[PDB]
RNA sequence: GAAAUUGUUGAAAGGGAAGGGCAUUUGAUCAGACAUGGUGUUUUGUA
RNA sequence: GAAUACUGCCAGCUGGGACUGAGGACUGCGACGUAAGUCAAGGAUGCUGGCAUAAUGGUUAUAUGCCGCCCGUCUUGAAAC
RNA sequence: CCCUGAAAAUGGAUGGCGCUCAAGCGUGUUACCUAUACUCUACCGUCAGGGUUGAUAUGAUGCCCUGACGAGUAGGCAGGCGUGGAGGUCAGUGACGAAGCCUAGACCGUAAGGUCGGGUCGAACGGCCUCUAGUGCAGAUCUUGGUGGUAGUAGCAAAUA
RNA sequence: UUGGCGGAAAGGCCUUGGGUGCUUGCUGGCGAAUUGCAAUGUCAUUUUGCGUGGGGAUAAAUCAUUUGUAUACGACUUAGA
C-alpha cells in the first residue's frame, strides 16, 4: 500500500489532437506537431496548442 | 414410483418389501408381448430364444376432467396415460473377441534391458 | 468476404538474435576427484558398482572402466555428478589414456525408419579394454582385498545415514 | 524405521503418549499399543474420577442414544484420547485410524514381540517425585469396566511363560558371550579391534 | 512451418462462469458481474469464483495466436483465399461454415497450391 | 547380496500450509535419519522420487513416476521442502517416497 | 421441433444434503507440431 | 607482558541449494592486454540423451488436502427465526 | 500463587483433545512457521514524460523508449460485445444445403462474445463503413402458456342390502 | 519327518532324524560391454475369472396352502410326501 498525496491515473486535462474530424486540420496539426518537435521555436508550439482549441476558444479576431 | 405403498412378503423375491399386481398394466403388456411374438414368428424367428431386449414406458397427453372442492373451487382429475415399445431379439452366441494390436513404445533402455534378459536367460 | 482484411499485415521477415556475451570457460571439478580414485555409481546400468576414474573428457565426462576382469564394466565415460569419489585410491600411472576422447565413443544414431518391433561389439573397444585392465590389476594385486572389493557391490544397509557416512 | 511399533504402555501418561501416536500415524507409522490398563494420569484418582463423571453427565436430551458414547474400557479411554487429537472426520483421519489398535493385556499376536517404551511420555522422567498420579485400569473399573481380573489373570499366566522363556535365553546368550570371549584375542579380533568393532 | 514465436502462456485458461449458473437452468453460464449488495462473489471473499480483470490480459506477443503459431483468418473463396499469398507463415486460413463441399475442394486445391496453411481441412469431405 | 538400496526413505508429510490455507506447488518431506537443517543441508538439491503403481500398461510398465527436489529446509527437525513437475496428489500423505544421492557432491 | 419435466441404455459417485474455488492422482476423450529450402541426384515417370 | 571474548569493518577468499533467461544486427560505460585482440562490460548460451506419440498438455468425471452459508432488496447492521 | 467467600434451570466447552519440575503463571534468550504487506523479476492495463514523415509498403488515432501506479457501494465518464430494421460495399454464402436447434468435440478474446467440426433440417442469410430503435432479464406475491416434487398420496365411508 | 508346547484374538514357537542345495572360512579359472553420460528402469501382495489334472460331498430357503401362543401391513409362531 502507497499513502497517496495525489489522485492516480488522472489525465492532464489539456486537451491534445484535436476533436474535430477535419482532415485539412488534421493536416495543420500533422505539420505544427512536427515543427513543434524540432524547430525548438516558442512561436510552433503555441499555435500547436491553440489548434486544438474548440469554437468558444477560438473567437473571431 | 413406491411410497407409502403396503408391505408385503410376495417381494422377498426381488429382495424388496414394496410390491403390487397392476392388474390392467398386465393385461396391457401381455398384449404387447403376445403382438411382439406373433411379429417374431411371421419374421420368421426360433421363437424359444427369444427375451425380451428392450422394453420402455414414457407418458402420453394427459387427459381432463374436473374435481368438485369445498367452497365452490374446481381441480383437476387427470388420467396419465402411457406409450409403450418392446423389442424381442433372439439370445446369440458370444459376441466377439480380437481386441486391438496395442502397439508398444519402448525406449532405448527398456529394449536393452528385454535384450538383456533374453540374453541372460534361455 | 467473410473477414474484411487487416489494415496491416505483421512482417515475416525474422531478425537476428543480438551478439551474445557467454564465453565457455573448462569445467572447474571438484577436489576429490583426482585421477585413480574408486568411484561407486550411483545411476545407470551398473548403479551400485565400484569402478576406477581414469582421465577427464572433453565433455565434462570421466573415463572409467571396471576393470572389465573384476566386475564386468567396461571401458565407460560417467558423469561427475552421478559418482560418489570414494577415499580408496589406487595409482594409474602406466596407463595411455590418451587414445580416447569424444569421437572414440559414437552411437551411429538411428533413422526414424528402424523401428525394432521385436529386436555387435567393436573389436577396437575390446583388445583396448584387455590392453588397460591388465595394467590395472597389477596396481590392483599391491593392497590386499581391493580385488574383492570392487567385484563387490555397493548398498545402503538399514541404518546407514549418508550425510554421516564417509566414503 | 519399522513395519509396526509394539508400545508397551505401562508407566506412559496418557495424553503424551497419544500425542505421540496420533502423529505417528498421521505421518504413517503403524503402532499397536498393549498393556492399556497400566497408563497413568497425573492427578489424584478423585480428580480423575469426578472429571469422568463430569464427562459422564454429559449426553443427549431428547435421546440417549444418539449421545456422546462413554465407553469404559482402558484402551477405549486412550482411544478417545487419540481420536480428540486425530482429525477423525476425514478419510485422511480415518486411513490414519485404521492403522492402530488399543489392548488390555498383550494378545497372542504381539506377546512374541519386542515392546517398546516412548521415554517422553515416561511418568518417571515426566513428573516431579511426589506428585500423585492415576492407574487407568483402577479409574476404568470403577467407572465400569468388567474385566479387571481376568486380564490380571492371564497376565500373570503370560508373565509366567515369559519368565521360562528369558531363563533359556540368558542361559544361550551367557554362552554366547562366553565362546565370543574366548574366541577374542586372536589376530581377526585385534584386526576388528583396530578397525572399531 | 509458423514464424518463431515465444511460448503460448494463458493466464488463465478456465472459463469464466456466472455464479449460480450450475445452480439455476434459468441463469446461462455466460459471464455477468454480480451487482448484488451482499454478494460474496462481488465482495471478493475466500473460496469463491474469481471475476475477470484486465490483470489476466494475454501477452501481446503472443496474443491472437493458434497453437501452431498463426493467426486464424476466416475465408469464402479462392479471392478471400489469395489474399494470405505473402503472409503464410503469419496467418491461417478457415473455411466458413456455410461453403459447399465442391467449393471446399477449390479452396484446398489452391491453399496447397500457394502453400496455406488450411486449420479445417476436413468438412464437408465425403469418404 | 539382499540389499540393492542407493536411496534414501522419506515420507511426504503435507504441503505448505498456514493453519487454514495450503499451498499444493510446494510439499513438505521428512527424510529418515535426519533431526536438524544442518545435517538436512546435506540432501538440498537432490532428486525424489514418488513411484507408485497403477493398472493400465502405458509403455511398457505399470510402474509410473513423479520426479522433483529437494529446496530448502524447513523447521527446526530436519523436515525440507520439496517441488516436483506436477504436484503430489495429497492422498500421499504418509506415503513412502525416494531421496537419490545425485545430484551428487561427495 | 428448444427448455422445464420423463422413459430406456451407457458411464460414474454416494456413512445426516447437493453444488463451488486452488492443486494433483486416476479413468475417458482430444487438438497442434513433426514434411522443412538443404550438399544432393545412391534416381525413376528424365527433367 | 600477552591471549581470548564482545562489537564493528574489508572495493578478503571460497563451498552447497533454489527461482528467473525478459530483450533480439551494431552503437554505451568499462576491464585485462604494448598491440592485435579478449572478457563475467546496456538481460543465456554450449554439449548430450530419450521420445516423436496421447508421452507432455488441454477438456471432462471422480478421489484426496484445505477452503467455500442463498441470491435479489431495504438497512448502521442479512446466512438470518 | 492457591483456597473459602462462589447458588439456575436441554448436555458443554481455555476452540477441542488433553496437560501438573506443564502443554499453567511471571520473566529472559534464541531458532523456527506464514498475508493479496515489503524486495527483485515477467506479463496485462492506466497515466505521465519523450523519440520518430526519410526513402520502400501499408496503418502518425501508428511504431518505439522510459518511469510510476492498480481496493471500491451510491454515482460519473470512456472503450467495446450483442439484437430488429435502413443507405453503401464485398459482381459475399447458399437446395452439391441458408436460417434455426443439439453436441462433459476443437480454437480465439480478461470479458460481453466470436469461429470451426459432427448430427438434425429445409430456403434464405452474412462480413465491413455508416444510420436508426418498441435493442440485451433471474427476480417485480410480474403477464401468458407449459411442467414438476408432493403422489400412485389425501381420498372415492350420510340416505339399513 | 519324530516329539511336544501354545485358547486372550490359540493359527504360532520349539525340537528329533535323514535327504537336498548353497557356503564369501580360504585359494583359483571363465563370463559380463551396446541400457551407449541418468531416466522406478519394472523383481511386492490383494482379489477374481477361465483352463487343465488330482482329490472330496450329493442340500436347503422363500412364495403359495395352514396355524393363532402373533398381528395395521410386513414380521412372528406352527403344520403339511
Ligand atoms: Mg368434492
Ligand atoms: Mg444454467
Known sequence: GIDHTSKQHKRSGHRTAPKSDNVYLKLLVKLYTFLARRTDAPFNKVVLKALFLSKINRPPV | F?????????????????????????????????????????????????????????????????????????????????????????????????????????????????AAQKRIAA | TAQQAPKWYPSEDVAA??????????????????????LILLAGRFRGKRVVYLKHLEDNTLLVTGPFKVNGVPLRRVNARYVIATSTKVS???????????????????????????????????????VVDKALLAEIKKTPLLKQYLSASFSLKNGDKPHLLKF | ?????????????????????????????????????????????????????????????????????????????????????????????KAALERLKVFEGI??????????????????????????????????????????????????????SSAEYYAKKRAFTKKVASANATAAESDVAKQLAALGY | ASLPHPKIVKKHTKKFKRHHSDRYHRVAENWRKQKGIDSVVRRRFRGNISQPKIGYGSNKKTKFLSPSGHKTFLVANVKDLETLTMHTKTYAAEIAHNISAKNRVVILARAKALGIKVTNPKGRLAL | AESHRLYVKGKHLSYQRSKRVNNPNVSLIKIEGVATPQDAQFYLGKRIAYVYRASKEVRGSKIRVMWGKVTRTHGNSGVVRATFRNNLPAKTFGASVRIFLYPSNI
Not at chain 3, 17 to 38: C, D, E, H, I, W
Not at chain 3, 94 to 120: C, I, M, Q, R, S
Not at chain 4, 27 to 37: D, F, P, S, Y
Open chain 2, 2 to 114: 413406491n411410497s407409502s405403498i403396503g408391505r408385503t412378503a410376495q417381494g422377498k423375491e426381488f429382495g424388496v418389501t414394496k410390491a403390487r399386481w397392476p392388474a390392467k398394466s398386465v393385461k396391457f403388456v401381455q398384449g404387447l408381448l403376445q403382438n411382439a411374438a406373433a411379429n417374431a414368428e411371421a419374421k420368421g424367428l426360433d421363437a424359444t430364444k427369444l427375451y425380451v431386449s428392450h422394453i420402455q414406458v414414457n407418458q402420453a397427453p394427459k387427459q381432463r376432467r374436473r374435481t368438485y372442492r369445498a367452497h365452490g373451487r374446481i381441480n383437476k382429475y387427470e388420467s396419465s396415460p402411457s406409450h409403450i415399445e418392446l423389442v424381442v431379439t433372439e439370445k446369440e452366441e458370444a459376441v466377439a473377441k480380437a481386441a486391438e494390436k496395442k502397439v508398444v513404445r519402448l525406449t532405448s533402455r527398456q529394449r536393452g534391458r528385454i
Open chain 3, 17 to 38: 538474435p543480438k551478439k551474445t556475451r557467454k564465453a565457455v570457460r573448462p569445467q572447474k571439478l571438484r577436489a576429490s576427484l583426482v585421477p585413480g580414485t574408486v
Open chain 3, 92 to 130: 594409474v600411472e602406466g596407463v595411455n589414456v590418451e587414445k580416447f576422447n569424444v569421437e572414440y565413443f559414437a552411437k551411429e544414431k538411428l533413422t526414424k525408419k528402424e523401428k525394432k518391433e521385436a529386436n555387435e561389439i567393436k573389436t577396437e573397444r575390446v583388445e583396448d579394454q584387455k
Open chain 4, 1 to 93: 524405521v519399522e513395519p509396526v511399533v509394539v508400545i508397551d504402555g505401562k508407566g506412559h501418561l496418557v495424553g503424551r503418549l497419544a500425542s505421540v501416536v496420533a502423529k505417528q500415524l498421521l505421518n504413517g507409522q503403524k503402532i499397536v499399543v498393549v498393556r492399556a490398563e497400566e497408563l497413568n494420569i497425573s492427578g489424584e484418582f478423585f480428580r480423575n474420577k469426578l472429571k469422568y463423571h463430569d464427562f459422564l453427565r454429559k449426553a443427549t436430551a431428547f435421546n440417549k442414544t444418539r449421545g456422546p458414547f462413554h465407553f469404559r474400557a482402558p484402551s477405549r479411554i486412550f482411544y478417545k484420547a487419540l481420536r480428540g487429537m486425530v482429525s477423525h472426520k476425514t478419510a485422511r483421519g
Open chain 4, 107 to 160: 494378545p497372542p499376536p504381539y506377546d512374541k514381540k519386542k515392546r517398546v517404551v516412548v521415554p517422553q511420555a515416561l511418568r518417571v522422567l515426566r513428573l516431579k517425585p511426589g506428585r500423585k498420579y492415576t492407574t487407568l485400569g483402577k479409574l476404568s473399573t470403577s467407572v465400569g469396566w468388567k474385566y479387571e481380573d481376568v486380564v490380571a489373570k492371564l497376565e500373570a499366566k503370560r508373565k509366567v
